[model samples]
Target: RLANPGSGQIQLWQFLLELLSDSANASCITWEGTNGEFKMTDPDEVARRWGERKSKPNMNYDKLSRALRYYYDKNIMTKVHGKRYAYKFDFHGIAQALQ
Candidate 1:
């Protein structure tokens, strides 16, 4: 099957990065900070987007963050070194610049 067995349940993620990949949404990769350049976005917006994407309207920073952690366990994504953000998609090699 095309879908990854471990994360098949979360349609929100699949839709966001797969079906909607052409929306110019997932195509962008944002850099929070370099190895020592400081950071851009705080932790709030990151949590907000995580919650919004999962449709967890009531999801808080902690829970949303935890869910994101699941990505690591599932081997779905990896955080780029030197950059706090700048997530690299495992399925696709393209890395977009995000705001």
Candidate 2:
């Protein structure tokens, strides 16, 4: 079983990173490298999995992306310019947890 960092429901960002970390999830998401960059190749599938994780049953990329956008001000992550579903994990919280 995979780890869930906080609460019972997985945080959206946590799930995203987990997908990037696992080779089995490569078809859906993957790392861009040491800059903490990653992309969603199958955003719909990602959103679907997130929906299932939370039992939201109707979560979609539009909704999921909004939640990500909210993280920008918190300094937890950032959206990569000119990339469709690419994101860069910024700030220390994520890096600290991964280590």
Candidate 3:
């Protein structure tokens, strides 16, 4: 609801943006020292928070991760292999194009 804003149900990416922007959330999730890449510092806890947001009591990283993978197909995100729990945003080019 925070990052989601204005009537739309919170999306996975939207929710992640919120956590990413707040350094206090580093215990659960945060950028992996990059502008576009991030890692789930505590995947299980992050999944629980996501579950709280979506009201999915049984949510787990496996389920949460699959939802993220869905974004991959949509060109919204991409997995950063060779790094544990890392992923990169596809919004980079889109942001620069605004100029």
Candidate 4:
């Protein structure tokens, strides 16, 4: 039977590298542009995408939200007042590294 794949294995690192190596296909932990919403359209869609990314078919808003909360407290995201499509980002050093 299938179980949640255990974490922190070399295979997981390789999977991460495979995802990162292709910038176009790799999912960005951070969003861009003025849109705070995930790419699929709305919050529910964001939940769907999150589950898809993790390969967890049973993921729900409750579980996903708990995970997001961890990242939020880690300083990865913060509430802001702005346009509907605003992404938290700094432009200062974004481009040079890609060059």
Q: By lDDT, who's the top model here?
A: 3
State the C-alpha lDDT per candidate.
0.43, 0.79, 0.80, 0.39
- Which is the better candidate, 1 or 3, if ranked by TM-score? 3
Question: Which tens-of-lDDT digit does each residue in 1-99 have in candidate 1?
Answer: 133522534442343344223433332323233331112133456455546656667666566446545665554555555755445444531222120
The TM-score, computed over Cα atoms with residue i paired to residue i, of candidate 3 is 0.83
**Residue range 1-99, candidate 3, lDDT tens digits:** 123342237778778877889899999898887758999989999899888888887999999999999888766789998998998988853354233
Model 2 misses residue 83 by how many Å? 1.6
**Which is the winner by lDDT between candidate 2 and candidate 4?**
2
Model 4 TM-score relative to the real fold: 0.39
Q: lDDT of model 4 at residue 35?
A: 32
Candidate 2 ranges beyond 4 A from true positions: 1-7, 95-99
TM-score of 2: 0.83
Model 3 — which ten-residue stretch has the worst lDDT? 1-10
Q: Candidate 2 at 53: error in angstroms?
A: 0.5
- Runs in model 4 with CA error above 4 Å? 1-41, 81-99
What residue pairs are clashing in model 3? none
- Which stretches of candidate 1 lie above 4 Å from their native place? 1-12, 18-46, 49-57, 92-99
